[PDB]
Symmetry: C3
């Protein structure tokens, strides 16, 4: 029994993120470089600010033939009063990936399955579709609005950007 | 289905912990700062030493209006030869939170659900209630004694602190 | 319900791994020390390269009485186009341990359970046995060949080491 939940992760450059901790003996990213990060999170339909992403990217290797990096990522997605989802897996700057859903809290207690990561604009816009199993209830309607198809040009609704009650969930994470 | 398990985490300052790696742009905690840690773990009734917590807090932001920090935490709870529980989620220095139970080993194989984290004395005393689903069996009686109600004043039993046989589980983690 | 899967992890010294981030005051490993890593992953029968391991070891304590270290490990095992498995738990340099399976993706979507970690040569050769629950299908035959007897002398098939078509899985992770 799968419930799809899609969200847009956007770096609006106002959270001091990403923070690069440089250790690799390379001008390029390399093993040793650690990247704590936190970006804003919006609903799949771009109408509401829900919260944030928060966690750690561990650089694994630069991939020169793909013109990108492989990170191993451990982080959570915060949904204001509703709770959160946690993930572990590959973040490849150069292609879509699937991460494991390691669990959740709140309405996400019991969550499991995988989530597809699509990078739209490096590094500032990402789109995700969680294929959620194990939820106690149907997801709230304000989170399951039909998603905006992902494109380079997507923007949150101005109400969501401006943090108006119509453009946020209750206690949205910040 | 839900088996509730409570434990006290106590920092007794004898494990080199916390170790603060301070990298942030700020004088206060900020993104970039990392805090590997390990504390002692006692049963919910405070009668027995069970083991340790072990993992990493990733600083996400300072929260000036709440006089405290938001961390993203990834860590495990060790119960001697019984096994361990793993978690991922928010640790807020100023209020309670819930973390995802990401999995378990030993008697905790198959573990899922969420855990409530209550801070009792910052930073040395914390109380957790795991709402455990998925376990193959009823939890052993030595781990499910009636919890001491959480307060600022709790202490582990003097026999547990002193690592006497009556105050430890067999091969308690250290 | 339970499907067993063994793999060999081998550091062939060509991936810049491990990377020791030294922060503890001591010449020996201690809390503060972080070790990003990535090794090669082969089938338990050693006939095929499947992919890699990738993640972070957090040093928890040195254990003088065992002449070794305790790490807390967060990492994934990559199986090419099959997907991946993610884990959280203890790596002890001086004895076998079990880690938690936190989830998977691809064929390993919905994966849970635990994995045994057995060190064969510190730290270049390890042998794993996953006890996998939650999988949609039986594991593919090319991953379930009888394991080579674990020892310090194990080596990948020469076709596997040389990346010949007959010694790799489809789109093996690198
Ligand atoms: C979960 C572990 C899986 C594979 C092991 C991987 O290589 C990583 C092990 C972490 C640390 C071992 C590195 C030891 C190097 C010692 C040199 C520095 C010193 O002796 O203090």
């Amino acid at each position: 029994k799968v419930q799809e939940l899609s969200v847009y992760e956007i770096n609006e450059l106002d959270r001091h993120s990403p923070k690069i901790l440089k250790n690799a003996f390379s001008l390029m990213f390399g093993l040793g470089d650690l990247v704590p990060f936190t970006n804003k999170l919006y609903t799949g339909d771009l109408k509401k600010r829900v919260g944030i992403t928060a966690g750690l990217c561990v650089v694994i290797e630069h991939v020169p033939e793909k013109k990108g990096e492989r990170f191993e990522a451990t982080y959570s997605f915060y949904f204001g009063d509703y709770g959160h989802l946690s993930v572990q897996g590959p973040y490849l700057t150069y292609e879509d990936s699937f991460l494991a859903i390691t669990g959740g809290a709140g309405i996400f207690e019991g969550a499991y399955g995988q989530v597809k990561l699509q990078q739209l604009v490096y590094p500032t816009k990402l789109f995700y579709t969680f294929y959620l199993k194990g939820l106690a209830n149907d997801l709230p309607l304000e989170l399951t609005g039909t998603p905006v198809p992902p494109s380079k040009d997507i923007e949150p609704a101005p109400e969501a950007k401006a943090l108006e009650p119509s453009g946020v969930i209750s206690n949205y994470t910040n």
